[PDB]
Amino acid sequence: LRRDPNLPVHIRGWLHKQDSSGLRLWKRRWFVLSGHCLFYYKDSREESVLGSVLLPSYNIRPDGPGAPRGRRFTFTAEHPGMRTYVLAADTLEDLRGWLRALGRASR
Numbered sequence: 001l002r003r004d005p006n007l008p009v010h011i012r013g014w015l016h017k018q019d020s021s022g023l024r025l026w027k028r029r030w031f032v033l034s035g036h037c038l039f040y041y042k043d044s045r046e047e048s049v050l051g052s053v054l055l056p057s058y059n060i061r062p063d064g065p066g067a068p069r070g071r072r073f074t075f076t077a078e079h080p081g082m083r084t085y086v087l088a089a090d091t092l093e094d095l096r097g098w099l100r101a102l103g104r105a106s107r
């Protein structure tokens, strides 16, 4: 997936992403939601894309209260047969902001 530079951005910012497997650590990456796609990078320069997701197929949901994953403010984006993304926002305000935007893209 390629990002269109001259396209408006719905929201962008830091999120923590859990490793698919391994020691299951949280990596802080810079995320950008442009169009119905989610792109992420190393930092806020938004220079080289590290990964991307076509949201319309996905289901994105809050893991609920209580830090059940070991961190507060986590949510999960999944769709059977595709890669699951486990994400964490820094604050409730950031989580709400991301959930609202990601909902609009997926639908």
Ligand SMILES: O=P(O)(O)O[C@H]1[C@H](O)[C@@H](OP(=O)(O)O)[C@H](OP(=O)(O)O)[C@@H](OP(=O)(O)O)[C@H]1O
Pocket (backbone or CB within 6 Å): 017, 018, 019, 020, 021, 022, 027, 029, 050, 051
């Ligand atoms: O090298 P180890 O110790 O195994 O951990 C890797 C790196 O942190 C990768 O980032 P980078 O290669 O850019 O430093 C990351 O991919 P991302 O860069 O896409 O975040 C992987 O997360 P996954 O998305 O689960 O593969 C994670 O498993």
